[PDB]
Amino acid sequence: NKGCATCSIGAACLVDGPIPDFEIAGAXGLXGLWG
């Protein structure tokens, strides 16, 4: 959806590898995953 534009980036901490820890910096991406 055009609503979740404030965080079109996407949810990805990367803490599941390099170990940067919940490095999302914009979970808004979820707003787009649905619309």
Judged by phi (left if over 0) then psi (alpha if -120 to 50, else beta), residue 25 lies in left
Residue 24 CA to residue 11 CA, distance in Å, equals 5
Please give the single-letter amino acid code of residue 2.
Answer: K
* ∠ CA 30-11-34, rounded to 5°: 20
Residues 18, 24 contacting (CB under 8 angstroms): no
Q: Tokens at residue 3, please? A: 């609503």
Residue 16 CA to residue 26 CA, distance in Å, equals 17
Domain boundaries, the chain: 1-35
Please give the single-letter amino acid code of residue 7.
Answer: C
Task: Report how this structure was experimentally obtained.
Answer: NMR
| Residue that has been written with the tokens 């619309």 in this structure | 35
